[PDB]
Design a protein around this ligand. Structure first.
Ligand code: HDD
Ligand code: HDD
Ligand code: HDD
Ligand SMILES: [Ca+2]
Ligand SMILES: [Ca+2]
Ligand SMILES: [Ca+2]
Ligand SMILES: [Ca+2]
Ligand SMILES: [Ca+2]
Ligand SMILES: [Ca+2]
Ligand SMILES: [Ca+2]
Ligand SMILES: [Ca+2]
Lengths: 675, 678, 452
């Protein structure tokens, strides 16, 4: 509603100033036709002042990201576990807006950097805006919010030269990770495929912190939020991610945009783990510690409702850039915990909007407005867009008949702090000793990945640590990695020419947990939206016919098909010059195009070797690949015909049926070497 | 209200955050009943953050002021002199918002400082917002906008100690005035009663600069804007103004507010002088020079329409504080001239809103919004409220079919610069010699005042210049004033114990012009809203009766009546403790209260001598005063007021008393009570 | 460093607040060891408030870039052609700071996008800061500054979805180019290897506009600035640039930084073409039109001096992010022309610094300060760092003895507008017909390239 009221249509009409005076804006007013521009040209100055002031500070973290509208629908009346109004009835719908992001990069940095990712969700509830400001990884680097600028200074570019962009592959970051062992768990997640998701739709969301569900009788339970993807879990490989950062920095935002435009809006089951207050230390670690997960073997997930994103913004700046999330946007039926990471966040997100917005009335921007009436005695401030009719904005008053009325647990559906909560003890700047195991869970996570996934994680660390210049930092990194796993430390040390420290088995173990592996999570549950590149030629009308035949068969099943040839024409979407294997989830060469794949093939229309390099890159990166028409191509690529995920069929139908199974498998991991 | 779409009502409902979450706001969340406050108390921090951020920079000038909504109505179809849409039909109405102000004082300074006054009018026209950003004085201190910081630094407080507030009565101001002779004309105005108007309703507004009216055929004429009060012109006296500043700093804003609430919303005829382009230098001065008026004897006023203010704001900060006027808010049919003061203003008022608002989307505030659609390619910026559908905001485009289309003289009702305008010559930083007579028009104004009015102007200068510490500066002041009038320099010099310099008659003359004198502008055309204090007593039930009878008779005629007595009760509005002569336009004592006027009278309920002081001050400041009931000698003798004085009334009959007293309210001030230099 | 006065050393000492109280910053203050954080924890709040407020708006264009300090050295006394003090003696040295950039991308976008590039140079002269705010391409896309938002909207990402980053390869850009044919000359330059230079050191810098040199006697000549690389000209190839954008988004800034650190600081000869006022239309186009070059065959380069960059910044944000260039930073001896693109720039760069800095005292930032005294009556404003002793900051005054004195052509080495300049005619919003050939110069350029 606040959005619809502020939509501005410029599909017709004459140009006006911001005060509705019709004007022009194409030629400056000058003293003669070859003369100096005049100060009295208000048309020039208003247009250029606006331009000059377009930009606002980027977000201090998560500067790079993209958003969409949708709806949350409750599966049930959840009154038995929370008073939350948005959860109080089967089928109850609440509008949402979600923004997804990286963490370290500035605006304009690439989507496919290796990083932690944001997953921030606003529920415009009938009892106020409720935000769950989460990440795609369920644990955080640090245990106390006061350390956030340390973490973030260390990962962001070195501040003398501002190098490197959007990367932890520098001395300072690994200096911090090695000195602050709490970082191990999130580190291991970021060095897995969770640091390079295939799309925002193929990752989960996590609140990280323990929160409370509070009932209308005052009782509480402890919860963790999990948003579980209905699209499946999928990652890129690092070598692919690096090329994609160059070829399409906008890959995740375009994937989102496109999925929504085609009627394939992504979905998640909004879930919780729910445990009793008495179980704060029962699972072998402290539920106040944001570097720990509750293994699902100890507390299963309950599905609360469906999150669907199905509408793109109208103006990115107004909606996506200006959305201002806060964990302080809480509603009756939810409460905080004493997680010292959460506790400090509550301060930060209120304060930082003053930086972004430049003034205190940021909740008035349409994307930040609620969908219920606002009744309070907040007044004035720069940018004040309301005209308040209550001329006695103080409590207690008689002159406004004691309105607005105080809301609390007893009346008015007020927020209230869970009334069972207490504090006791000295006023301290001390870390709880219950937070001191920094290594067991990183090992739990590592144990739960498949062998090739473990290899990819090792290889990520090998990559990044080999770029650390400091020999001491690199030694200190091995010291910490060795506390998680001696084998990781040895394997990583081998790439950097150092020896690993001797095994220290204090935290070693062989326990695993379900639901953290990407490679182990089975085939994708849908292939709709996945991209197939068909490599063809204009030389041979046979090639274009085969391509068209595959197109119809793949499109029917919701795949996005790109036919690539030397030059554009009817049925060809993309020239070889602009094509890359990073643009596809699977690649098919029509056998009529075989000539383009020869070592001597050359054209002024694309770079030498491009058609073959698309095919070979796709294969090396694990993708389903094949040749359709029943040979030259598989041999030019040194691609084995018997390999899993390599397809070779004369029959278009048999080809598509086999090829679509391989898109669901998504990645053929047998093509990656192990230690 | 014209801003009803933006109104928020809080007459019902439970307290919420700004995101609609019901909350409380009266107790902090604490770790135990006697414990420390918690960081997780979001209720506390959202509330206090908002409080901590309430303030915005005051305006760089005109910080002290007040506003109201109203309606402009055209008297005619003016399409034969201007294309301006708001003037294009008889009876055509346009919403307005007006803010009045002083100039030098900060927020919270007193309304009744001696100063220039602003009068800034927004017309929310059907072809865009059009602002006339004027003053109550028709001429400006300086002739080029680049000098404005110099002027304003010199008048504003000295920057080491920030003293004095809201006053030109200090060395720096008079240094600048004496060094920059352009200032003489506005200085003479500010030192007249125009520097201390009775109210905003009793002053005129002027655009100061020559502008252009431009027809749809592209022809132009030169115009001056003159908003002429239908309430009459009136001033305070200085001795009164000084007290009033202390007793009621809000006097002008309260007067306006009250007049609108009572259904007596003030009115002005919006008028122009209209002259041809060929007359730019025909009147003996340059029409580009903002230190000159065109005498009404050379060019008469044409009444274009009625401005009436009739609705107070709902939220002062949102509407009055935030209104951001600009002379760059111009409409088709009006154009600029090459007046160097005007030319630079155009820059300043767009820039300065960035300071006030903190971001570039200030035209989106409700009070600044137009009442017609906006179609342009301005985008983003902090605080962006709009959600623009056009995703191709560049010209020229095909992907948005070429919209928005360019508007100009021939299409779309565009603004256009008057096509007859030209420029010639070297690119220069020099002053036109046509601007060099700084002294003839100040003398024209002074010549046009009555003798008591001229004494008041001399006394204002005596007062201020006596507070200048520097003997140098004071001599330089006398040097400049002497160029306007030797008699002024002599009479000022006498108070400060210097000799005036020898006469220099270069610019002396005896010409006069109509319409600049307050004292000479004849009785007020209406007495509605004027204030009558009735001084009574609770000791005599007959004095209360007398007061009640006078109340009924005066209220019939639209006077604001206050009955004063020792204590409040039914029919008594104010105590002597809170009353003052600055609160009234006339003072009546009921003769049943004579005992309160004796030298010996004392009470713990009010300061010694308060009833009599009210009467004596009112008399000494020129107001109509009297005693009603027939026994007048005890009160008049205590006050040293002669029963036969002009504007002194004594009648037993309430009806006759009121008939006579009302004539005196229209006369307004009895100027025979002020001494003149021989 | 030239900014040594403002440096802060933290190689020793105990952690303090901003007001010098020693503190800690690693654990929050809590009501109990597993308790909630306390509002009275000022250590936490001061630290996190600073963090929360670290960012400032990126530049509206040229957001992605990097800078270095160096020195300019005059080859001669140029008194013959300009009163500019920095050019008045052989060997005269002036400190400089230079920032290089792309145009369209935001912060964090890749260095090796295909784009126009900035080359902005500040000379911290003994008669005031003088900036030449240039590009590596000598011509601009448009002929009137009022059009800049249109160009820039069209080349920046589409505003519904903010796609694509740092690229002209989208409908809106090519729509604008094809509807505004002025854009052809720059477009051909940007689609050449000049759009993907090998490094900032392997590109030239151009002022683009005609400016004036003005002598002390008031006479003037028309000039174009050229900064000619002593490293040579080199480009990437486009396939290579695309991969490099992914592998190393920081390639140009690293190349620069490393060159300086190794003692290979890059050099340019600072040159001008110098023609008479009477030649404004003599070359077959109008010297007021920023979409045209003067062919070197018509006016040769004169070498004025040497630009060498040889010192990297100490704090990128303080120095590089904060440097606020302006074409209005001009000195006696130089003047503007009536190029309608230049004319409107003069407004933009003073105004935009209010957005970036959030207040009016941005010339007080160390990187923006001049290296000579400041004497004026500018006062107050948010962030005011000066404590002004003159309590009579108005002119004309007696109470401060008439100081500061006015400076002009004849007194105090004032800036002055070239006194031969004039204007004639109607006040118009019309384009000179002398600007109308959008296509010959693009062809000239294309013809000058080799076959490959
Ligand atoms: C003490 C400070 C602090 C700490 C410990 C954290 N953050 Fe945060 N976060 C910020 C301070 C902050 C911020 C500076 O306040 C940001 C920048 C922009 C904004 O609105 O808030 C932000 C932004 C931000 C966003 C981007 C929201 C958007 O798309 O606009 C996400 C998703 C997260 N954070 C998620 C997290 C998670 C899951 C954390 C740990 C569980 C976390 N942050 C800890
Ligand atoms: C070069 C600068 C400059 C000059 C020469 C003037 N002013 Fe001005 N004026 C401003 C710069 C300014 C300003 C700094 O831009 C203000 C402060 C607040 C605002 O909106 O504009 C302003 C405010 C302001 C206001 C207050 C409007 C309101 O109520 O909000 C009035 C009535 C005037 N001025 C009137 C005048 C008149 C009649 C002038 C001469 C004919 C004049 N000003 C010259
Ligand atoms: C009407 C506005 C306008 C126009 C026509 C131009 N520019 Fe500009 N330019 C700006 C408005 C602007 C700006 C918005 O004012 C920027 C953003 C940051 C800043 O300081 O100024 C800017 C920044 C900017 C920078 C970055 C400086 C730095 O590194 O901090 C360079 C190098 C240029 N521009 C170069 C040019 C050249 C060579 C132009 C044409 C010859 C040009 N600009 C036309
Ligand atoms: Ca580093
Ligand atoms: Ca993986
Ligand atoms: Ca003084
Ligand atoms: Ca008077
Ligand atoms: Ca025009
Ligand atoms: Ca586009
Ligand atoms: Ca600000
Ligand atoms: Ca000059």
């Amino acid at each position: 509603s606040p959005l619809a009221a502020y939509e501005v249509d410029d599909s017709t009409g004459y140009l006006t100033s911001d005060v509705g005076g019709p004007i022009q804006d194409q030629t400056s007013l000058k003293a003669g036709i070859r003369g100096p521009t005049l100060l009295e040209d208000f048309m020039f100055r208003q247009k250029i002042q606006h331009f000059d002031h377009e930009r606002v500070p980027e977000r201090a973290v998560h500067a790079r990201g993209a958003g969409a509208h949708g709806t949350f629908t409750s599966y049930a009346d959840w009154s038995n576990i929370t008073a939350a109004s948005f959860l109080n009835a089967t089928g109850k719908q609440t509008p949402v807006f979600v923004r997804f992001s990286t963490v370290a990069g500035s605006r304009g940095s690439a989507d496919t950097a290796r990083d932690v990712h944001g997953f921030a969700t606003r529920f415009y509830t009938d009892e106020g805006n409720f935000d769950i400001v989460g990440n795609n990884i369920p644990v955080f680097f640090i245990q106390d919010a006061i350390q956030f600028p340390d973490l973030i200074h260390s990962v962001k570019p070195r501040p003398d030269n501002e190098i490197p962009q959007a990367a932890t592959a520098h001395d300072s970051a690994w200096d911090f990770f090695s000195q602050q062992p709490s970082t191990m768990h999130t580190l291991f997640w970021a060095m897995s495929g969770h640091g390079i998701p295939r799309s925002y739709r193929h990752m989960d969301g996590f609140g990280i912190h323990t929160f409370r569900f509070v009932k209308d009788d005052g009782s509480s339970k402890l919860i963790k939020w999990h948003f579980k993807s209905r699209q499946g879990k999928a990652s890129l490989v690092w070598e692919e991610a690096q090329v994609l950062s160059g070829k399409n920095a906008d890959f995740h935002r375009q994937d989102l945009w496109d999925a929504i435009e085609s009627g394939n809006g992504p979905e998640w089951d909004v879930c919780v783990q729910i445990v009793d207050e008495s179980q704060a230390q029962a699972f072998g670690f402290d539920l106040l510690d944001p570097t720990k997960i509750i293994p699902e073997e100890y507390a299963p997930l309950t599905k609360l409702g469906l999150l669907k994103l199905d509408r793109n913004p109208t103006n990115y700046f107004a909606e996506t850039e200006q959305v201002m999330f806060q964990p302080g946007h809480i509603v009756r039926g939810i409460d905080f915990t004493e997680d010292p990471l959460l506790q400090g966040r509550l301060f930060s997100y209120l304060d930082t909007q003053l930086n972004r917005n430049g003034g205190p009335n940021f909740e008035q921007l349409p994307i930040n407005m609620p969908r219920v009436p606002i009744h309070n005695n907040n007044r004035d401030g720069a940018g004040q867009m309301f005209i308040h009719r209550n001329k006695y904005p103080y409590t207690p008053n008689t002159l406004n008949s004691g309105y607005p009325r105080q809301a609390n647990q007893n009346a008015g559906r007020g927020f209230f702090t869970a009334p069972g909560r207490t504090a006791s003890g000295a006023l301290v700047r001390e870390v709880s000793p219950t937070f001191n195991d920094h290594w067991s869970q990183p090992r739990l996570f590592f144990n739960s990945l498949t062998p090739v996934e473990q290899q990819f994680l090792v290889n990520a660390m090998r990559f990044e640590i080999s770029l650390v210049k400091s020999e001491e930092v690199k030694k200190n990194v091995l010291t910490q990695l060795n506390r998680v796993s001696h084998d990781v430390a040895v394997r990583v040390a081998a790439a950097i020419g150092l020896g690993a420290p001797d095994a220290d088995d204090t935290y070693y173990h062989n326990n695993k947990t379900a639901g953290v592996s990407i490679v182990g999570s089975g085939p994708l549950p849908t292939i709709k939206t996945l991209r197939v590149g068909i490599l063809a030629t204009t030389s041979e009308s046979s090639a274009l016919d085969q391509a068209a035949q595959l197109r119809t068969r793949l499109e029917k099943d919701g795949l996005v098909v790109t036919v690539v040839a030397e030059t554009l024409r009817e049925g060809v979407d993309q020239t070889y010059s602009t094509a890359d294997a990073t643009g596809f989830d699977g690649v098919v060469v029509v056998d009529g195009a075989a000539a383009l794949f020869a070592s001597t093939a050359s054209s002024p229309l694309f770079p030498t070797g491009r058609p073959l390099q698309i095919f070979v890159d796709a294969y090396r990166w694990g993708k389903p690949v094949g040749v359709c028409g029943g040979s030259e191509v598989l041999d030019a690529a040194d691609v084995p015909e018997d390999g899993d995920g390599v397809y070779s069929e004369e029959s278009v139908d048999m080809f598509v049926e086999e090829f679509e199974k391989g898109l669901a498998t998504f990645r053929f991991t047998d093509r990656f070497a192990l230690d």
